[PDB]
Amino acid sequence: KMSECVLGQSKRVDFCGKGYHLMSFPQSAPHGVVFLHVTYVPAQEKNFT
């Protein structure tokens, strides 16, 4: 995830958060790592022919 979510933009569904992946920022934790996933989510659909 560090390489594919933070050092690039992924197309893998659900791999880098929910929505269309834009970017990620790492944060450190005591024995691990926390990823902040930024995604694009569409809203307010309308009907068309």
Ligand X SMILES: *[C@@H]1O[C@H](CO)[C@@H](O[C@@H]2O[C@H](CO)[C@@H](O)[C@H](O)[C@H]2NC(C)=O)[C@H](O)[C@H]1NC(C)=O
Choose the stretch contacting its own copies; rule: CB under 8 A; options: 3-11, 29-37, 38-46.
Answer: 3-11
Q: Which x/- pattern over 1-40 shows residues binding ligand X (rule: CB under 6 A)?
A: ----------------------------------------
Lookup: tokens for 21: 């992946």
For 23, the token pair is 């970017």
Residue 47 makes contact with ligand X by CB under 6 A: yes
Count of CB atoms situated within 10 Å of the CB of 48 = 4
Please answer whether residues 16 and 22 qualify as being in contact, where contact means their C-beta atoms are separated by less than 8 angstroms.
no
Instruction: Give the interface with its own copies as residue ranges (CB under 8 A).
Output: 3-4, 7-8, 10-15
